[PDB]
Amino acid sequence: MQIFVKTLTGKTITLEVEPSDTIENVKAKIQDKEGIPPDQQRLIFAGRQLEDGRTLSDYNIQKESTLHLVLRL
Amino acid sequence: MQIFVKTLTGKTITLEVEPSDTIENVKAKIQDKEGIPPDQQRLIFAGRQLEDGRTLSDYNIQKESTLHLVLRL
Amino acid sequence: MQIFVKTLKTITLEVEPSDTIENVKAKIQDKEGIPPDQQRLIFAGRQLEDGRTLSDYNIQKESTLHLVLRL
Ligand SMILES: [Zn+2]
Ligand SMILES: [Zn+2]
Ligand SMILES: [Zn+2]
Ligand SMILES: [Zn+2]
Ligand SMILES: [Zn+2]
Ligand SMILES: [Zn+2]
Ligand SMILES: [Zn+2]
Numbered sequence: 001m002q003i004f005v006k007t008l009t010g011k012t013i014t015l016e017v018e019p020s021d022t023i024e025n026v027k028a029k030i031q032d033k034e035g036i037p038p039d040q041q042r043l044i045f046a047g048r049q050l051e052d053g054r055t056l057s058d059y060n061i062q063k064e065s066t067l068h069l070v071l072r073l
Numbered sequence: 074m075q076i077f078v079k080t081l082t083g084k085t086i087t088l089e090v091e092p093s094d095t096i097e098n099v100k101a102k103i104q105d106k107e108g109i110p111p112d113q114q115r116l117i118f119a120g121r122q123l124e125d126g127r128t129l130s131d132y133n134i135q136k137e138s139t140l141h142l143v144l145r146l
Numbered sequence: 147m148q149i150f151v152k153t154l155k156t157i158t159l160e161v162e163p164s165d166t167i168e169n170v171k172a173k174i175q176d177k178e179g180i181p182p183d184q185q186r187l188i189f190a191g192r193q194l195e196d197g198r199t200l201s202d203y204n205i206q207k208e209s210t211l212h213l214v215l216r217l
Contacts, residue, residue, distance in 0.1 A: 001105065018094065018098040019098055019111075020094070020095045020097055
């Protein structure tokens with residue numbers, strides 16, 4: 001399962017996930033590529049800010065979904 | 074940790090999992106190989122139909138366990 | 147000899163006992179426009195494989211095949 005993440009450089013990146021891979025895991029995959037620590041990460045999807053504890057299933061993120069990465073002020 | 078999945082073609086496939094990798098994750102690994110969407114997947118193990126929410130630990134699936142994949146009508 | 151192919155509608159194909167599954171996939175392509183590569187046919191729990199024939203699976207007339215996509 002591969003989802004999409006629009007980063008801070010504009011360019012979109014591709015990450016391989018499991019449907020139960022939580023938001024904290026997704027943020028960790030971003031810092032393994034983008035470099036921005038999860039504490040300074042905010043993930044938006046379909047007008048909803050993703051909470052760390054919840055999973056991709058709870059937010060109904062499916063295959064090839066596009067996530068928008070923004071910097072947590 | 075590698076478990077076994079008897080698919081719909083008869084031939085058995087091999088998937089690498091974690092003991093906490095839930096059934097929804099296992100089904101996702103199948104559609105990454107077999108092609109059948111998780112919504113149309115039913116997994117049987119030791120006479121028990123595996124529920125999406127539960128994990129491999131809850132059903133006591135151990136290393137080298139064989140899972141039978143059937144098509145959800 | 148006609149067989150049914152059901153999904154999720156139901157399309158009907160005019161086939162031959164010696165038609166390979168690859169032939170069946172190509173018929174659906176000429177009917178619903180779906181490429182054979184993204185086709186996976188199942189008859190009675192068993193996913194049919196290209197090369198083997200309808201008679202090889204004892205798929206008689208008026209039998210119902212199930213179409214699953216690999217998009
Ligand atoms: Zn994948
Ligand atoms: Zn993961
Ligand atoms: Zn790492
Ligand atoms: Zn892991
Ligand atoms: Zn005929
Ligand atoms: Zn023919
Ligand atoms: Zn049937």
